Design an enzyme around this catalytic site. Structure first.
Site, PDB file in Angstrom:
ATOM      1  N   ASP A  41       0.810  -1.222   0.000  1.00  0.00           N
ATOM      2  CA  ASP A  41       0.000   0.000   0.000  1.00  0.00           C
ATOM      3  C   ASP A  41       0.841   1.269   0.000  1.00  0.00           C
ATOM      4  O   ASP A  41       0.681   2.126  -0.875  1.00  0.00           O
ATOM      5  CB  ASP A  41      -0.886   0.051   1.243  1.00  0.00           C
ATOM      6  CG  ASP A  41      -2.067  -0.861   1.155  1.00  0.00           C
ATOM      7  OD1 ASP A  41      -2.658  -0.990   0.062  1.00  0.00           O
ATOM      8  OD2 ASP A  41      -2.419  -1.442   2.203  1.00  0.00           O
ATOM      9  N   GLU A  66      -4.905   7.214   1.838  1.00  0.00           N
ATOM     10  CA  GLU A  66      -5.223   6.254   2.898  1.00  0.00           C
ATOM     11  C   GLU A  66      -4.022   5.918   3.786  1.00  0.00           C
ATOM     12  O   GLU A  66      -4.157   5.807   5.001  1.00  0.00           O
ATOM     13  CB  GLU A  66      -5.790   4.980   2.262  1.00  0.00           C
ATOM     14  CG  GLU A  66      -6.317   3.933   3.236  1.00  0.00           C
ATOM     15  CD  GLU A  66      -7.031   2.797   2.509  1.00  0.00           C
ATOM     16  OE1 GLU A  66      -6.326   1.933   1.933  1.00  0.00           O
ATOM     17  OE2 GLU A  66      -8.294   2.777   2.502  1.00  0.00           O
ATOM     18  N   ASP A 140      -6.363   6.090  -3.029  1.00  0.00           N
ATOM     19  CA  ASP A 140      -6.469   4.785  -2.387  1.00  0.00           C
ATOM     20  C   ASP A 140      -5.645   3.800  -3.226  1.00  0.00           C
ATOM     21  O   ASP A 140      -6.062   3.406  -4.317  1.00  0.00           O
ATOM     22  CB  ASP A 140      -7.926   4.343  -2.285  1.00  0.00           C
ATOM     23  CG  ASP A 140      -8.125   3.203  -1.297  1.00  0.00           C
ATOM     24  OD1 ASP A 140      -7.151   2.561  -0.871  1.00  0.00           O
ATOM     25  OD2 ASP A 140      -9.279   2.945  -0.940  1.00  0.00           O
ATOM     26  N   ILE A 142      -4.480   0.521  -3.082  1.00  0.00           N
ATOM     27  CA  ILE A 142      -5.054  -0.778  -3.401  1.00  0.00           C
ATOM     28  C   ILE A 142      -6.324  -0.939  -2.567  1.00  0.00           C
ATOM     29  O   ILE A 142      -6.246  -1.225  -1.376  1.00  0.00           O
ATOM     30  CB  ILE A 142      -4.070  -1.929  -3.082  1.00  0.00           C
ATOM     31  CG1 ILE A 142      -2.867  -1.893  -4.017  1.00  0.00           C
ATOM     32  CG2 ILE A 142      -4.756  -3.278  -3.203  1.00  0.00           C
ATOM     33  CD1 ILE A 142      -1.649  -2.571  -3.453  1.00  0.00           C
ATOM     34  N   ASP A 143      -7.486  -0.739  -3.181  1.00  0.00           N
ATOM     35  CA  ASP A 143      -8.742  -0.838  -2.438  1.00  0.00           C
ATOM     36  C   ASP A 143      -9.303  -2.260  -2.452  1.00  0.00           C
ATOM     37  O   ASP A 143      -9.179  -2.974  -3.444  1.00  0.00           O
ATOM     38  CB  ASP A 143      -9.783   0.155  -2.956  1.00  0.00           C
ATOM     39  CG  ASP A 143     -11.082   0.097  -2.166  1.00  0.00           C
ATOM     40  OD1 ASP A 143     -11.071   0.450  -0.968  1.00  0.00           O
ATOM     41  OD2 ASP A 143     -12.113  -0.329  -2.733  1.00  0.00           O
ATOM     42  N   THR A 145      -8.455  -4.537   0.205  1.00  0.00           N
ATOM     43  CA  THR A 145      -7.227  -5.224   0.599  1.00  0.00           C
ATOM     44  C   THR A 145      -7.460  -6.666   1.097  1.00  0.00           C
ATOM     45  O   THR A 145      -6.577  -7.522   0.977  1.00  0.00           O
ATOM     46  CB  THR A 145      -6.424  -4.343   1.604  1.00  0.00           C
ATOM     47  OG1 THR A 145      -5.387  -3.641   0.889  1.00  0.00           O
ATOM     48  CG2 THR A 145      -5.808  -5.168   2.712  1.00  0.00           C
ATOM     49  N   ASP A 270     -11.874   6.622  -0.761  1.00  0.00           N
ATOM     50  CA  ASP A 270     -12.728   5.560  -1.303  1.00  0.00           C
ATOM     51  C   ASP A 270     -13.689   6.049  -2.378  1.00  0.00           C
ATOM     52  O   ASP A 270     -14.061   5.276  -3.261  1.00  0.00           O
ATOM     53  CB  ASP A 270     -13.578   4.923  -0.193  1.00  0.00           C
ATOM     54  CG  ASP A 270     -12.758   4.119   0.784  1.00  0.00           C
ATOM     55  OD1 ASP A 270     -11.806   3.468   0.330  1.00  0.00           O
ATOM     56  OD2 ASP A 270     -13.062   4.132   2.001  1.00  0.00           O
TER      57      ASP A 270
HETATM   58 GD   LIG Z   1      -4.262  -0.111   3.471  1.00  0.00          GD
HETATM   59 GD   LIG Z   2     -10.264   1.640   0.980  1.00  0.00          GD
END
Ligand SMILES: [Gd]
Ligand SMILES: [Gd]
Length: 327
Positions: A41, A66, A140, A142-143, A145, A270
């Site tokens: 991330d 994030e 963000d 890598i959404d 996870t 997000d």
């Molecule tokens: Gd994260």
């Molecule tokens: Gd996220």
């Protein structure tokens, strides 16, 4: 911001490469201890940050997200994640984070410094200038996870909507107006769309949109009420689907008409990217709690960066009025 947006596509694909590489490299795959998720991330966020600042001096300070730019390793040492300029530097840093795992450090350094030349030709036509001084960015890296780590490559979708799987993972980069809070530009990258069973390589897909002073443009949509809600959703044709980024995309692509999330556990990063793209198609995102008493989500002010009161995402204000009536 067509030049910035074009650059945002390239880096998003670079981020998709890192994401793919960490599940496909023998050494990287196998990875208060070594926390690879946090590492992946932070690294992807830093790659986006460093590349943009590089191309557009001054933007680096405007890129929020994030993750932090910091990591605690196995010894309790705090490491500031600054990459480069050479690939040699990046190896030293990553081996500080990984105890001395030279193979995994080199492998990551390669993918990080790898040139990408991804360019939408439709966006090369467009020439739009947005003053750099009014832009903020929410990343963000890598959404979804949970879905990324589980790594199910084998899931069948229900009516085009994946309930879980690597398809639910998105890279999310959103650009907003600092003074007004309104989202301006958005990039969504799905690194894991189609897998060849025989070669095992993943192909991905990229989506973009821009909404600036009444000019609204977006990427070409492939063809082919419906409501998507999260896996944990408990509020009273409905589909479960993992990923905040991905559910938003379902609405963009027209696979779902409405994405509702009632809790306070999504954040600006997000929703920004997808909200911008929804704006460019005539839709948007409203505060759920407010409607139950059309006010869009804003991205400049802190409550801290949670979307409190939840959200409804829609492509069509017609569909929104229809759905809000029913409920
Ligand atoms: Gd994260
Ligand atoms: Gd996220």
């Amino acid at each position: 911001m067509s030049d910035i947006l074009q650059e945002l596509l390239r880096v998003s694909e670079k981020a998709a490469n890192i994401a793919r590489a960490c599940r496909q490299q023998e050494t990287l795959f196998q990875l208060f201890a070594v926390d690879f998720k946090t590492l992946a991330d932070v690294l992807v966020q830093e790659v986006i940050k460093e590349n943009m600042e590089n191309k557009f001096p001054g933007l680096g300070k405007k890129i929020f997200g994030e993750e932090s730019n910091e990591l605690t390793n196995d010894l309790g040492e705090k490491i500031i994640m600054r990459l480069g300029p050479t690939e040699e530097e990046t190896v030293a840093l990553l081996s500080k984070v990984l105890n001395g795992n030279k193979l995994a450090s080199e492998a990551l350094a390669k993918v990080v410094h790898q040139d990408v030349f991804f360019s939408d030709p439709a966006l090369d036509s467009v020439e739009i200038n947005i003053p750099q001084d009014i832009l903020g960015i929410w990343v963000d890296p890598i959404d979804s996870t949970y879905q990324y780590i589980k790594g199910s490559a084998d899931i069948t979708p229900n009516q085009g909507i994946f309930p879980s799987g690597l398809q639910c993972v998105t890279v999310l980069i959103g650009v907003y107006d600092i003074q007004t809070g309104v989202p301006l530009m958005g990039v969504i990258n799905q690194p894991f769309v189609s897998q060849d069973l025989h070669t095992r390589r993943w192909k991905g897909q990229c989506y973009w949109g821009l909404s600036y002073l009444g000019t609204n443009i977006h990427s070409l949509l492939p063809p082919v009420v419906v409501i998507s809600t999260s896996e944990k959703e408990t509020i009273k044709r409905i589909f479960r689907a993992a990923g905040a980024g991905y559910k938003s995309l379902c609405v963009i692509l027209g696979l779902a008409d409405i994405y509702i999330f009632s809790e306070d556990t999504t954040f600006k990063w997000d929703s920004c990217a997808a909200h911008a793209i929804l704006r460019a198609m005539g839709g948007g995102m409203v505060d759920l709690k407010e409607c139950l008493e059309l006010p869009q989500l804003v991205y400049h002010v802190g409550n801290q960066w949670a979307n409190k009161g939840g959200l409804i995402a829609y492509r069509s204000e017609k569909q929104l009025e229809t759905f809000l009536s029913r409920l």
